[PDB]
Amino acid sequence: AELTPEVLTVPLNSEGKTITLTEKQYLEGKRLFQYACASCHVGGITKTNPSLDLRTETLALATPPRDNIEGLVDYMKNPTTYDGEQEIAEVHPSLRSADIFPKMRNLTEKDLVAIAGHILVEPKILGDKWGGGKVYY
Amino acid sequence: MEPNPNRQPVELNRTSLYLGLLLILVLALLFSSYFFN
Amino acid sequence: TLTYDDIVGTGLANKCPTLDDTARGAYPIDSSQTYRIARLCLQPTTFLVKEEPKNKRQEAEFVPTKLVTRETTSLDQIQGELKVNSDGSLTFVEEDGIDFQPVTVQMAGGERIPLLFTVKNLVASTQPNVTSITTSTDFKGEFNVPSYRTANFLDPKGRGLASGYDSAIALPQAKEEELARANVKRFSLTKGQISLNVAKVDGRTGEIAGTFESEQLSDDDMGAHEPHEVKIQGVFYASIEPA
Amino acid sequence: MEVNQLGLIATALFVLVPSVFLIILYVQTESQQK
Amino acid sequence: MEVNQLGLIATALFVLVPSVFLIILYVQTESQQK
Amino acid sequence: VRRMPAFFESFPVILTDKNGVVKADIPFRRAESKYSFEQQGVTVSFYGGELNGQTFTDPPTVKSYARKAIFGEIFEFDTETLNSDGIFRTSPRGWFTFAHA
Amino acid sequence: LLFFQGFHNWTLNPFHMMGVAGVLGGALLCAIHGATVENTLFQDGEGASTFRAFNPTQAEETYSMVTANRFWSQIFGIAFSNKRWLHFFMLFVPVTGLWMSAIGVVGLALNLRSYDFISQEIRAAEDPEFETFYTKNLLLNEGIRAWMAPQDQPHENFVFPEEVLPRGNAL
Amino acid sequence: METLKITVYIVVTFFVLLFVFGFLSGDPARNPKRKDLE
Amino acid sequence: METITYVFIFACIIALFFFAIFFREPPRIT
Amino acid sequence: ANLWERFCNWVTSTDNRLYVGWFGVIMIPTLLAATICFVIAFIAAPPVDIDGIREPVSGSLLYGNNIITGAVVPSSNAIGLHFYPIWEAASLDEWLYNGGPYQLIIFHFLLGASCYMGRQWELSYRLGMRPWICVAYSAPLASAFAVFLIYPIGQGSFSDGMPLGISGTFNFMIVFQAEHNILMHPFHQLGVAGVFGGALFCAMHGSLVTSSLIRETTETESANYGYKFGQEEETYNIVAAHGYFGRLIFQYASFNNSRSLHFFLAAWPVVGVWFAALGISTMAFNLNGFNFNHSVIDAKGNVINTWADIINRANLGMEVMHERNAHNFPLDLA
Amino acid sequence: KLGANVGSAQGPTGLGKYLMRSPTGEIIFGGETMRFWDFRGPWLEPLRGPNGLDLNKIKNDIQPWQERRAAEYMTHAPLGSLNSVGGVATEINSVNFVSPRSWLATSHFVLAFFFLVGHLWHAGRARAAAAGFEKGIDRESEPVLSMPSLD
Amino acid sequence: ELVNVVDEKLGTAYGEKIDLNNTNIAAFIQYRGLYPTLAKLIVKNAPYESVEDVLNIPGLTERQKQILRENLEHFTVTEVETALVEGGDRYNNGLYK
Ligand code: CLA
Ligand code: CLA
Ligand code: CLA
Ligand SMILES: CCCCCCCCCCCCCCCC(=O)OC[C@H](CO[C@@H]1O[C@H](CS(=O)(=O)O)[C@@H](O)[C@H](O)[C@H]1O)OC(=O)CCCCCCCCCCCCCCC
Ligand SMILES: CCCCCCCCCCCCCCCC(=O)OC[C@H](COP(=O)(O)OC[C@@H](O)CO)OC(=O)CCCCCCCCCCCCCCC
Ligand SMILES: CCCCCCCCCCCCCCCC(=O)OC[C@H](COP(=O)(O)OC[C@@H](O)CO)OC(=O)CCCCCCCCCCCCCCC
Ligand SMILES: CCCCCCCCCCCCCCCC(=O)OC[C@H](COP(=O)(O)OC[C@@H](O)CO)OC(=O)CCCCCCCCCCCCCCC
Ligand code: HEM
Ligand SMILES: CCCCCCCCCCCCO[C@@H]1O[C@H](CO)[C@@H](O[C@H]2O[C@H](CO)[C@@H](O)[C@H](O)[C@H]2O)[C@H](O)[C@H]1O
Ligand SMILES: CCCCCCCCCCCCO[C@@H]1O[C@H](CO)[C@@H](O[C@H]2O[C@H](CO)[C@@H](O)[C@H](O)[C@H]2O)[C@H](O)[C@H]1O
Ligand SMILES: CCCCCCCS[C@@H]1O[C@H](CO)[C@@H](O)[C@H](O)[C@H]1O
Ligand SMILES: CCCCCCCS[C@@H]1O[C@H](CO)[C@@H](O)[C@H](O)[C@H]1O
Ligand code: OEY
Ligand SMILES: [Ca+2]
Numbered sequence A: 001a002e003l004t005p006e007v008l009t010v011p012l013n014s015e016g017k018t019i020t021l022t023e024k025q026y027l028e029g030k031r032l033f034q035y036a037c038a039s040c041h042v043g044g045i046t047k048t049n050p051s052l053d054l055r056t057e058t059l060a061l062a063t064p065p066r067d068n069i070e071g072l073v074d075y076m077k078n079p080t081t082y083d084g085e086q087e088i089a090e091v092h093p094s095l096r097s098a099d100i101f102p103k104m105r106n107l108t109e110k111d112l113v114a115i116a117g118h119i120l121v122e123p124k125i126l127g128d129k130w131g132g133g134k135v136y137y
Numbered sequence B: 001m002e003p004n005p006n007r008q009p010v011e012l013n014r015t016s017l018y019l020g021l022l023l024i025l026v027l028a029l030l031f032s033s034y035f036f037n
Numbered sequence C: 001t002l003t004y005d006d007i008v009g010t011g012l013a014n015k016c017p018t019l020d021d022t023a024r025g026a027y028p029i030d031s032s033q034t035y036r037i038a039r040l041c042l043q044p045t046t047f048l049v050k051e052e053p054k055n056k057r058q059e060a061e062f063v064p065t066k067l068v069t070r071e072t073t074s075l076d077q078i079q080g081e082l083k084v085n086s087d088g089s090l091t092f093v094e095e096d097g098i099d100f101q102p103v104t105v106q107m108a109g110g111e112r113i114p115l116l117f118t119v120k121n122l123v124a125s126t127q128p129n130v131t132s133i134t135t136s137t138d139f140k141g142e143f144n145v146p147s148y149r150t151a152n153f154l155d156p157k158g159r160g161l162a163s164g165y166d167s168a169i170a171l172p173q174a175k176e177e178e179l180a181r182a183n184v185k186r187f188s189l190t191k192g193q194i195s196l197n198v199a200k201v202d203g204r205t206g207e208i209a210g211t212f213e214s215e216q217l218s219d220d221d222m223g224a225h226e227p228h229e230v231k232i233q234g235v236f237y238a239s240i241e242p243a
Numbered sequence D, E: 001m002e003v004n005q006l007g008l009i010a011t012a013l014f015v016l017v018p019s020v021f022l023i024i025l026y027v028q029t030e031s032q033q034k
Numbered sequence F: 001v002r003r004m005p006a007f008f009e010s011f012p013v014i015l016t017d018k019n020g021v022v023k024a025d026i027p028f029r030r031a032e033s034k035y036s037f038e039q040q041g042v043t044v045s046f047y048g049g050e051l052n053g054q055t056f057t058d059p060p061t062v063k064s065y066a067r068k069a070i071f072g073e074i075f076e077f078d079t080e081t082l083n084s085d086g087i088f089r090t091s092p093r094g095w096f097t098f099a100h101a
Numbered sequence G: 001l002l003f004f005q006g007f008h009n010w011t012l013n014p015f016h017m018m019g020v021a022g023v024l025g026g027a028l029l030c031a032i033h034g035a036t037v038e039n040t041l042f043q044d045g046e047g048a049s050t051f052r053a054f055n056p057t058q059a060e061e062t063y064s065m066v067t068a069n070r071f072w073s074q075i076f077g078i079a080f081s082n083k084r085w086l087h088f089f090m091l092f093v094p095v096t097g098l099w100m101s102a103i104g105v106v107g108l109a110l111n112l113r114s115y116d117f118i119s120q121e122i123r124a125a126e127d128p129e130f131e132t133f134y135t136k137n138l139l140l141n142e143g144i145r146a147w148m149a150p151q152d153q154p155h156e157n158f159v160f161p162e163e164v165l166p167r168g169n170a171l
Numbered sequence H: 001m002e003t004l005k006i007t008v009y010i011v012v013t014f015f016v017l018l019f020v021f022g023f024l025s026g027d028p029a030r031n032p033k034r035k036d037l038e
Numbered sequence I: 001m002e003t004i005t006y007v008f009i010f011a012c013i014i015a016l017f018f019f020a021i022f023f024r025e026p027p028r029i030t
Numbered sequence J: 001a002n003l004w005e006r007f008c009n010w011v012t013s014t015d016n017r018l019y020v021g022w023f024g025v026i027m028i029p030t031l032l033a034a035t036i037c038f039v040i041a042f043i044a045a046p047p048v049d050i051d052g053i054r055e056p057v058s059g060s061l062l063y064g065n066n067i068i069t070g071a072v073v074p075s076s077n078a079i080g081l082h083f084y085p086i087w088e089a090a091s092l093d094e095w096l097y098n099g100g101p102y103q104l105i106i107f108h109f110l111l112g113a114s115c116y117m118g119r120q121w122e123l124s125y126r127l128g129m130r131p132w133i134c135v136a137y138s139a140p141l142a143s144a145f146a147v148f149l150i151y152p153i154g155q156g157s158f159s160d161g162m163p164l165g166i167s168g169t170f171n172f173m174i175v176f177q178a179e180h181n182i183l184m185h186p187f188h189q190l191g192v193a194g195v196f197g198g199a200l201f202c203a204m205h206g207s208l209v210t211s212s213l214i215r216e217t218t219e220t221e222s223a224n225y226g227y228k229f230g231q232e233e234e235t236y237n238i239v240a241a242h243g244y245f246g247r248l249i250f251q252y253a254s255f256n257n258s259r260s261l262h263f264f265l266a267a268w269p270v271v272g273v274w275f276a277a278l279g280i281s282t283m284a285f286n287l288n289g290f291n292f293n294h295s296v297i298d299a300k301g302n303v304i305n306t307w308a309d310i311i312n313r314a315n316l317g318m319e320v321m322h323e324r325n326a327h328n329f330p331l332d333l334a
Numbered sequence K: 001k002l003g004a005n006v007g008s009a010q011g012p013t014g015l016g017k018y019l020m021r022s023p024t025g026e027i028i029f030g031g032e033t034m035r036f037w038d039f040r041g042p043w044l045e046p047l048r049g050p051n052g053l054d055l056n057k058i059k060n061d062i063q064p065w066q067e068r069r070a071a072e073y074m075t076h077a078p079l080g081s082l083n084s085v086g087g088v089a090t091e092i093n094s095v096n097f098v099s100p101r102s103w104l105a106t107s108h109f110v111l112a113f114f115f116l117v118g119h120l121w122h123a124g125r126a127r128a129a130a131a132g133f134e135k136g137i138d139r140e141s142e143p144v145l146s147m148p149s150l151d
Numbered sequence L: 001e002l003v004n005v006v007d008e009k010l011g012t013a014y015g016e017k018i019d020l021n022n023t024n025i026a027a028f029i030q031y032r033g034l035y036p037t038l039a040k041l042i043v044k045n046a047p048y049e050s051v052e053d054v055l056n057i058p059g060l061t062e063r064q065k066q067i068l069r070e071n072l073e074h075f076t077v078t079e080v081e082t083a084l085v086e087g088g089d090r091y092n093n094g095l096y097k
C-alpha cells in the first residue's frame, strides 16, 4: 500500500468539489495537528470531551458540516458547538482566540488547510483507529 | 557452661518398641470407630 | 467569619452553622411574598440501627453504632422552594444540594452497616397557620432513598447491573439457580421519613436551627441481602429568604 | 456414611505421635556405644 | 469457607513425616559415643 | 456461538452468522450495546437429546444455553451426588502426561 | 511474561514462587558473600586499594572467617562457619530454584495451572461483598485475556465487539 | 486517644534521646584500635 | 481449622528461629 | 563509672549475643512494633477500604484468606499521604476500616530497617572490620523504600504503596506494569540483569569453589568436615578453579584474584538492584518505560505492530480492569 | 453545562461523582482525585469557600479562563515515557512531551540516592581510616580473637 | 422472578431508538442539530408521555420545534427506569471512548 493521490483527495466543500493534497501538505498538516491539537485530539478523539470525535461521519453530522476542507478551516477560525448554536472560541483554540491560544498565532490559511487535510485523510488510512480510542490501539 | 551432673542416657530396647507399638496400634484400632462415630 | 484556611482539617467543615441562645424570636411569613430555603444543613450526631431478633415476635430495638467513615457524613448546601399553602402551612420542596452521604457504621460485634444517608427529593411541611416560624414550628416530610450503589457498580467478581458479567464465571459449570440472587443485580428505591424540630429562630436574619430525626433503609448490596432500618439523629440549620 | 470429619486426623495423630516417640527412643538407643 | 477436606491431614503429614525422619536422625546422632 | 479455546478460563459469548459476521452477544457494558439477545431477538431450538423439538425465546434461557454452547455440545449433569463445584478438572490423560513429563 | 500472567495466573504457582526464592536468594547470597569477604579482608599490603594484596598461590585465607562469623552471628543471629558448606549452598539455592520453576512450566504445558482457590470462588460467587487481592488479580487477568487475545492470537480470528470487552468505570 | 498519643510521644522522645546522647558519648573511641579520635 | 494450621506452622517457624539462634551448635576455633 | 557510662558500655558491647548498639536502641522497638502489629493484623484485621470508595478488601486469615491471598491492606485513598496514627482515629474500629495498621507497620519497618543498616556499619566498626557490608544492604533497603514510601509519595497516596502480602505484591506489580510499562524501563531491565546475574554468579562461584575443594575426607564422610572453622589455610585450590574457568571461556574472562572476584560478586547484584530501586522511585514520578506503540508505520500509513504493541494490548487489559469502581473520569492521572 | 446537578450526583460507589467530603468534612473533587484535595492553585481557589468547594460559585462563577486552564493542565499531566511520548503508558505515539517536573524530580531522586550511598561509603571509610583498619584486619592482632566466644 | 432491568429494557424500543425518558444524553450526537442545546432541554424536561410531547418544552424556538419534528422518528419513550436515571447517569454514565 502507499499514500496515493486518490487517498490524498478530499472534499473541499459541501457542494461536492474535491481538492487533491500534496504529500508535503499532508505531512505539514500532521505536524501542525501534533503541534497545536494532539494534546487534546491524539488519534482523533477528544480528551476533554470524549463524546465528540474527529471521525468523518461525526464531522458530517455537525452543524455546519465539518466533513470538508472549508468547513474545518472555518471551524479553526470560529469553532462552534456540535449544533452550531454557540461560538466556543473562548474555550477552544482558533484564529479568533489566538491571543489566549498562542499556538494558533502564526497559522496561515495554508496551515489551516493542511491541518484540515490531515483530519480528513487520516481516517482514510487508519479507519476505525481514528477517533476509535484505546479499544483500537 | 559447666556440664550438668544430673544427665542420664535414655533407653528403649527393641522388645519395648514392639510392645509399645502394639499398644498404640491396638488402642488405635479400638478407638478409631469412635473417633469416626 | 472564618476562611477555608481557618477551617481546613479542624473537622468544622462537617458541622452545620449554629445559632445563639438569644435566637428565640419569630420569623414573619407574608403570604404574598415568595420564599426559598437558601441553605439547609443536616449534621448527623447519632446513627441507630434496628436489631433483627430471632423470634420475630419480640420488640426490636434501635441500637447505637460506631461511625467508621470519619467526618464525611453531613448534608449541606441544600436549597429549595418554601411554599405558603392555603391553610397557612409551609412546604419545603428540595431542589438541589449535597443531599446525600454514604455512611458506614459498625455494630457491636463487628457487623458493618453501609447506608445512603440522604434527604433526596425531600418534601416537608409544617402545621397549618404558621404566621411566623417560631421554636414551636416543625417540619415533617418524606424523601427518596435510591440504591447505595448505582448501576455501573461491579462486585468483586465483576458482576453488575448496567455493566459487568451476568454470571459467576469462576464456576463455569455450576448450577445458576442457587446463584440467581447474586448474579442478577437489582436497583433498590425506597422512601424515608424525616422530622425537623425548630429549636432556634433569628427573625431578623430569617435563620433557624434545631434537631432532626430521619428514618430510612440501609444498603442492600443491589439486592444481595435485606437492608436494615436506620434512625439518624442530629442537628439542622436553615436560612430562609424571600425569593 | 456421615462420619466425623476429624476422625481421620484424630486416628492418624493418635497413632503417629506416640509411635514416633517410641521410634526415636529406640533408634537413639541402638546407636549408643555397644 | 469450603476448603478441601483432606487439606488438613495432608498438611499435617507433610510436616510430620519428614520432620520426624530428621528428629530420629539427629537424636541417634547425639547419642553416639564421643 | 463462538467456542472457547483451551487457553481461556473464561470466554465472552459471541454469535456470528455462517460468514463469521457478529450478529449477537452478551454485553459487558449495556449502554451502547447493539448485539444484545433482546435487541436481536435470539431464540434457541433443540434437535436430538432431551430437549428435542423444543424452542426457547425468553432471553435469560436463550443466554444460559448460549453460555453452555461455548463449551460445545450441551449436557445435563448430576452435581449433587459428589457435591461438584462446577470447575473443570483434567482427565487421566492429563494427569499421566504431567507426572511422566 | 504478561501472557503467562493473564492466562496461567503464573505468579500464583508455588513452583514459580520457589523459582523466585531461588533466584532472589541466589542474588542475595552473591551480594552478601561478596561484601562479607571484601569487608573482613586481612591487611596483606600497604596499599589503600586492597586488591594488590592477594597472591593466587598463597596458602592463607585472604579474609577472616572467624570475624565474619562473629559479625553475622551478632547481626542476623546465625552465620556460616563452614566455608565448604557456604559455597555448596551457593550452588544449591539458585539451581534448586530454577529446577522448581521448570517443573511449574511443565505443568503449564498442559494448562495444569495454579489458577484458582476453589474456596475463594465459592465464597465470592455467593457473597458480592467478599473481596481479596486474589479476586482483584483475576479481574486483571480477565482484562489481559480479552484486550490482548485478538492481536496476540491472530489465527483465532477473534472479533470482540466493544460491548463485550470487560472494563471498569470510565477507563 | 489523647493518653495514647502522649504515651507514644514520651516513648519516642526517650529512645531518640538515648540515640543522640549515645552517639555523643565518645563513640569514635569505641573501636578496637586508635581511640584518641578528637 | 485452616487458620489454625497456617498460624501453627508460622508459630513453629518462629520457635525454630529461637532454637537455631540461642541453641545453635557453638562455632569453635581449632 | 556512673550509670550512663555502664549503659553505653553495655549497649556498644562486643560481647552481647546479638549486638545492640545505638542504631539498635531505635531498631529493636520499631521492629518489634512493626512485627507484632503485622502478625496480629495478618491474622485478625477486618476488611480495609483501600481505594477510599467504601469497598473494603479483606486481607486477614480469619476473614477468609489463606497464606497466599492474605495481606495487610494499604491505607485508604481518602487519607492519601495524610499521617494516620491510631490517635487520629475516633476509634480502633475506624482505624481498622481505613488501613491504619498498614501505616503503623510500614513506618516502623522503614525506620527499623534503616537502623538495621546503620547497625551493620556500627558492629563493623566495633569489630575492626572494613565498613561496607551496610552499603550492600542499602540495595534491598532502597527497594523497600521505593515500594513503601517513594511510590506512594509520587502518586499522592499510601493506598498505592505495595500491600503487605503475597497476592497483594502481584497486584502491585501488574497495576505498575499497566501504568508505567516497567518491563520496557531500562532500570528494571538492569534490575533483572542484577538478580539473574546474581543467581548465575552465585551458582558459578559456589560450584567452582566446591569443585576444587582439597581432598581432606574419605568417601563415607561429608566433604564439609574437610574444613575446620578458624583454620588458617584456604580449603580449596583457587589455581585449579581459575584454570578450569579460564579454559571454559578463555584465560582472561576469569578472576585469578579472589579479592576482585568477591568484589564483583558484591557489585553486580548490588548495582543492578540499586537501579531496580531507582526504576520504581523514578516511575514514581511517572517517567515511564519506553513507549513504541505504533512506532512502525508502512508507506501508506498503516500501523505495522511489533511486540511492543502486543505488550500495549496486555497493559490495556490491566488498565481498564484495575480498581473497577474507582475512576469517574477518562484518564487515570494517578 | 449539559444540565447535571453536580452537588447531588451520586456516583457508582455511593460517593459523589464530582464532589464529596474530605475525611474532615471539606467539600472536594470526587473520583480518585480525592487523594489530592490538599492541592491549591490560583485557578481553583476562587471556587473555594470556608467549607471547601462552593456549590454556588461552581454553579454560577466559573470563568472561561478557568475552563481553559483546567483543560490545559488536565492534558499536560506529568505522565510520559522515557523517549518522551506524552501521557499514560498505554497511549499511542503522537505527543512529544515529558513534564519538566518529572525530569527534575526523577533526576534529583537518583542523584540524592546515590549521594546517600556516597555518604555511607565515605563515612564508614573515614571511621575505619581514623581508627586504623581501613586496609583490613591485622593478622597478628585480630580483635575478635581477643573477645570471649558468643556462646 | 429476578430480572436485570437494563437487559430487559434493551428488548423494548429503548434498544432501538433514543428514549427521551431514559437514554444517556450522548446518544443525541447521532443526529444533526440535537446536541448539546436540545439534548440538554430534552433531558431536563423529561419524562414525556409521548414523543410528540417533546415539542411542548417551554422556551423552544420555532427552529428547534422544526428540528425536533424532523427527529421524532428517531425517538421513543418508555417507562422511566430508576437504574438508568439515578446518579445523574443520563448526563454522565461512566462511558467515554
Ligand atoms: C520478583 C520478580 C521475579 C523473579 C526473580 C522471577 C524469576 C524467574 N522467572 Mg518469573 N515472572 C515474574 C516475576 C519474577 N520471576 C512475574 C511477575 C511474571 C508474570 C506472571 C513472571 C513470568 C515468568 C514466565 C513466563 C517465566 C518466568 C521464569 C522465571 C525463571 C527464569 C530463570 C532464568 O534465568 O531463565 C533464563 C533462561 C535460561 C537460564 C535458559 C538457558 C539460557 C542460556 C544458557 C543462555 C545462553 C546465552 C548465549 C551465550 C547467547 C547470548 C547472546 C546475546 C546476544 C543475548 C526465574 C525463576 C521462566 C521459568 O519459570 O522457566 C522455567 C519463565 O518461563 N517468569
Ligand atoms: C525506637 C522507638 C520508637 C520510634 C522511633 C517510634 C516511631 C514511631 N511510632 Mg512507635 N511505638 C514504640 C516505639 C517507637 N516508635 C513503642 C515501644 C510502642 C508501644 C507503646 C509504640 C506504639 C506506637 C503506636 C500505637 C503508634 C506509634 C507511631 C509511631 C510513628 C509516629 C511517632 C510520633 O508521632 O512521634 C512524634 C514525636 C515527637 C513530635 C517528639 C519527638 C521529640 C524528639 C526530641 C524529636 C527529634 C526528632 C528529629 C527528627 C531528630 C531525630 C534525630 C536524628 C538527628 C537522628 C513513628 C514512626 C504511630 C504510627 O505508626 O502512625 C502511623 C502510632 O499510631 N508507635
Ligand atoms: C539535573 C539534570 C538534568 C535534567 C533533569 C535534564 C532534563 C532534560 N534535558 Mg538536559 N542536560 C543535562 C542535565 C539534565 N537535563 C546534562 C548534564 C547535559 C549535557 C549532556 C544536558 C544536555 C541536554 C541536551 C542537548 C538536551 C537536553 C534535554 C533535556 C530534556 C529532555 C531529557 C531527555 O530526553 O533525556 C533522555 C533520557 C536519558 C538520556 C536518560 C539518561 C540515563 C542516565 C545516564 C542515568 C544516570 C544515572 C546516574 C547518574 C548513574 C550513576 C552511575 C552509578 C554506577 C553510580 C529534559 C527537560 C533535551 C531538550 O529537550 O532540550 C530543550 C535536549 O535536547 N539536555
Ligand atoms: C504484646 C507485646 C508483648 C511484647 C513483650 C516483649 C518484651 C520482651 C522483654 C523480655 C526481657 C528478657 C528477654 C531477653 C532474651 C534475650 O534475647 O537474651 C539474649 C542475650 C543474653 O542477654 C545477656 O545476658 C547476660 C547474663 S543473663 O543471662 O541475662 O543473666 C548479660 O550479662 C548480658 O548483659 C545480656 O546481654 O541478650 C543479648 O544478646 C543482647 C540483647 C538482644 C536484644 C534482642 C532483641 C531482638 C529484637 C528483634 C526485633 C525483630 C523481632 C522479629 C524477629 C522474628
Ligand atoms: C499431647 C502430647 C502428646 C504426647 C505423646 C506421648 C506419647 C507417649 C506414649 C507412650 C507409650 C508407652 C509404651 C511403652 C511400652 C513399653 O515400653 O513396655 C515395656 C516396658 C519395659 O520396661 P523396662 O523396665 O523393662 O525398661 C526397658 C526400657 O527399654 C524401657 O524404656 O514396660 C513399660 O513401659 C511399663 C508399661 C507397660 C505397658 C505395656 C503394655 C503392652 C501390652 C500390649 C497391649 C496391646 C494388645 C492388647 C490386646 C488385647
Ligand atoms: C563509583 C561508582 C559507584 C557505583 C559502583 C560502585 C562499585 C562499588 C559498589 C558496590 C558495593 C558493594 C558492597 C561493598 C563492597 C566492597 O566493600 O568493595 C570494596 C572494594 C575494595 O575496597 P578498597 O578499600 O580496596 O578500595 C576502595 C577504597 O579504599 C579506595 O582504595 O571497593 C572498590 O573496589 C571500589 C571501586 C570503585 C571504583 C569505581 C567503580 C565504577 C563502577 C562502574 C559501574 C557502572 C555500571 C553502569 C551500568 C552498566
Ligand atoms: C536482630 C536479629 C534479627 C534476626 C531475626 C531472626 C533471624 C532468623 C534467622 C533464621 C533462623 C533459622 C535458621 C535455620 C537454619 C540454621 O540454623 O542455620 C545454620 C547454618 C550454620 O551454618 P554452618 O556453616 O555453621 O553449618 C555447616 C555445617 O554445620 C553443615 O553441615 O546457617 C546457614 O546454613 C546459613 C544458610 C541458611 C540461612 C537461612 C535463613 C532463613 C531466613 C528465613 C526464611 C524463612 C522465613 C519464614 C517466614 C515466616
Ligand atoms: C488544533 C488546532 C485543533 C483542531 C484542528 C481541532 C479540531 C476540532 C474539531 C473539528 C472539533 C469538532 C469535532 C466534531 O464536530 O465532531 C473540535 C471539538 C473539540 N475540541 Fe478541538 N481542535 C483543536 C485543538 C483542541 C485542543 C487543544 C483541545 C483541548 C483543549 C480541544 C478540545 C476540543 C473540545 C472539547 C471539543 C468539543 C467542543 C464542543 O462541542 O463543545 N481541541 N476540535
Ligand atoms: C511430634 C512428636 C515427636 C516426639 C519427639 C520426642 C522427642 C524425644 C527426645 C529424646 C531425647 C534423647 O536424648 C538423648 O539421649 C542420649 C542418651 O539416651 C544422649 O546421649 C548421651 O549418652 C550416650 C550414652 O552414654 C553417649 O554415647 C552420648 O555421647 C551422650 O551424649 C543424648 O545427648 C540425648 O540427646
Ligand atoms: C539544637 C539543640 C542545640 C542545643 C545546644 C547544643 C549543646 C550540645 C551539648 C552536648 C553535650 C554532650 O555532652 C556529652 O555527654 C556525654 C555523656 O556524659 C559524654 O560522655 C562521656 O561520659 C560518658 C559517661 O561517663 C562516657 O561513657 C563517655 O565515654 C564520655 O565521652 C560526652 O563526652 C559529652 O561531650
Ligand atoms: C490477642 C487478641 C487480639 C485479637 C483481637 C481481635 C479483635 S476482637 C473481635 O472483633 C470481632 C469484630 O468486631 C468480633 O466479632 C469478635 O467477637 C471480637 O472478639
Ligand atoms: C434460565 C436458565 C435456563 C436453564 C438452562 C441452563 C443451561 S443447561 C444446565 O447447565 C448446568 C451447568 O450450568 C447443568 O448442571 C445442568 O445439568 C443443565 O441443565
Ligand atoms: O493505579 Mn491506576 O492509577 Ca495508581 O490510582 Mn489511579 O487507578 Mn488507582 O489507586 Mn491504586 O491505582
Ligand atoms: Ca421545637
Ligand SMILES: [Ca+2]
Binding pocket: F083, F084
Ligand atoms: Ca454446592
Ligand SMILES: [Cl-]
Binding pocket: none
Ligand atoms: Cl461513536
Ligand SMILES: [Cl-]
Binding pocket: G136, J171, J175, J321, J322, J323, J324
Ligand atoms: Cl486492582
Ligand SMILES: [Cl-]
Binding pocket: J326, J327, J328, J329, K030, K031, K032, K033
Ligand atoms: Cl477518577
Ligand SMILES: [Fe+2]
Binding pocket: G033, G037, G087, J205, J209
Ligand atoms: Fe567465596
